[PDB]
Amino acid sequence: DRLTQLQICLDQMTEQFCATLNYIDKNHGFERLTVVPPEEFSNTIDELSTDIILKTRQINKLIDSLPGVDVSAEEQLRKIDMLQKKLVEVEDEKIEAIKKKEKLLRHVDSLIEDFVDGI
Amino acid sequence: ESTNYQYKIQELRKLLKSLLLNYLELIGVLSINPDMYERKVENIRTILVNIHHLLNEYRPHQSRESLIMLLEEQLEYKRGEIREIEQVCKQVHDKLTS
């Protein structure tokens, strides 16, 4: 949900990189080297160009934050292996604990049962 | 053979600048003769493509970081579950001594 939020974020650019080429194409923007005044065009072209520069920045800061970059496939493949193991260990610890607590509970309950008046 | 990703990110970072320059020219911020204009457009399409193939080839390595992120998460949960059981036993000690 990052490499895809990147991928996702990179579609917008593709979309604005066409949402632009469209203007440039559909407004004789090629002929810049009913018609839209030479001002509106520029205000528009800048309004998009600038917007695209900000996307380029974002897409990097994201590629930097993108996880796994530095790490190897091996440095990971074991890290998973470990976590798998250290995880079993922790559940056996959980189990045990649970048992010990329920024993404790059984103890308390027994006590409480013997304080009751009525057969 | 390791499918080096430290590399794939290099490229990705390159294509990106390359894509930005090439766009900077199409727009007119940078200078370029009109018999190139369309080649710029050529380059942008091709650029955006390669980029896609990269991010595309980056999912495996992505997936792993996700697993390693889940395991981490649940391992922290269980640990907590125990430390929560522990507390109760300590509060029962307090409650017992008043």
Swiss-Prot record, chain A:
It comes from the Eukaryota. Keywords: Activator, Coiled coil, Nucleus, Transcription, Transcription regulation. One of its GO terms (cellular component) is nucleus. One of its GO terms (molecular function) is transcription corepressor activity. The keyword Amino-acid biosynthesis does not apply. SUPFAM superfamilies: Mediator hinge subcomplex-like. It is found in: Nucleus. Residues 71-111 form a coiled coil. InterPro entries: Med7/Med21-like (IPR037212), Mediator_Med21 (IPR021384). Transmembrane segments: none annotated. GO terms for biological process: negative regulation of transcription by RNA polymerase II; positive regulation of transcription by RNA polymerase II; positive regulation of transcription elongation by RNA polymerase II; positive regulation of transcription initiation by RNA polymerase II; regulation of transcription by RNA polymerase II; RNA polymerase II preinitiation complex assembly. Component of the Mediator complex, which is composed of at least 21 subunits that form three structurally distinct submodules. The Mediator head module contains MED6, MED8, MED11, SRB4/MED17, SRB5/MED18, ROX3/MED19, SRB2/MED20 and SRB6/MED22, the middle module contains MED1, MED4, NUT1/MED5, MED7, CSE2/MED9, NUT2/MED10, SRB7/MED21 and SOH1/MED31, and the tail module contains MED2, PGD1/MED3, RGR1/MED14, GAL11/MED15 and SIN4/MED16. The head and the middle modules interact directly with RNA polymerase II, whereas the elongated tail module interacts with gene-specific regulatory proteins. Component of the Mediator complex, a coactivator involved in the regulated transcription of nearly all RNA polymerase II-dependent genes. Mediator functions as a bridge to convey information from gene-specific regulatory proteins to the basal RNA polymerase II transcription machinery. The Mediator complex, having a compact conformation in its free form, is recruited to promoters by direct interactions with regulatory proteins and serves for the assembly of a functional preinitiation complex with RNA polymerase II and the general transcription factors. Present with 1391 molecules/cell in log phase SD medium. Belongs to the Mediator complex subunit 21 family. PANTHER family: MEDIATOR OF RNA POLYMERASE II TRANSCRIPTION SUBUNIT 21, RNA POLYMERASE II HOLOENZYME COMPONENT SRB7. This is Mediator of RNA polymerase II transcription subunit 21. It comes from Saccharomyces cerevisiae (strain ATCC 204508 / S288c) (Baker's yeast).
UniProtKB/Swiss-Prot annotation, chain B:
GO terms for biological process: negative regulation of transcription by RNA polymerase II; positive regulation of transcription by RNA polymerase II; positive regulation of transcription elongation by RNA polymerase II; positive regulation of transcription initiation by RNA polymerase II; regulation of transcription by RNA polymerase II; RNA polymerase II preinitiation complex assembly. One of its GO terms (cellular component) is nucleus. It is found in: Nucleus. GO terms for molecular function: transcription coactivator activity. Its main location: nucleus. Keywords: Activator, Nucleus, Transcription, Transcription regulation. It comes from the Eukaryota. Component of the Mediator complex, a coactivator involved in the regulated transcription of nearly all RNA polymerase II-dependent genes. Mediator functions as a bridge to convey information from gene-specific regulatory proteins to the basal RNA polymerase II transcription machinery. The Mediator complex, having a compact conformation in its free form, is recruited to promoters by direct interactions with regulatory proteins and serves for the assembly of a functional preinitiation complex with RNA polymerase II and the general transcription factors. Present with 7598 molecules/cell in log phase SD medium. Component of the Mediator complex, which is composed of at least 21 subunits that form three structurally distinct submodules. The Mediator head module contains MED6, MED8, MED11, SRB4/MED17, SRB5/MED18, ROX3/MED19, SRB2/MED20 and SRB6/MED22, the middle module contains MED1, MED4, NUT1/MED5, MED7, CSE2/MED9, NUT2/MED10, SRB7/MED21 and SOH1/MED31, and the tail module contains MED2, PGD1/MED3, RGR1/MED14, GAL11/MED15 and SIN4/MED16. The head and the middle modules interact directly with RNA polymerase II, whereas the elongated tail module interacts with gene-specific regulatory proteins. Belongs to the Mediator complex subunit 7 family. This is Mediator of RNA polymerase II transcription subunit 7. The lineage of its organism: Eukaryota, Fungi, Dikarya, Ascomycota, Saccharomycotina. The gene is MED7.
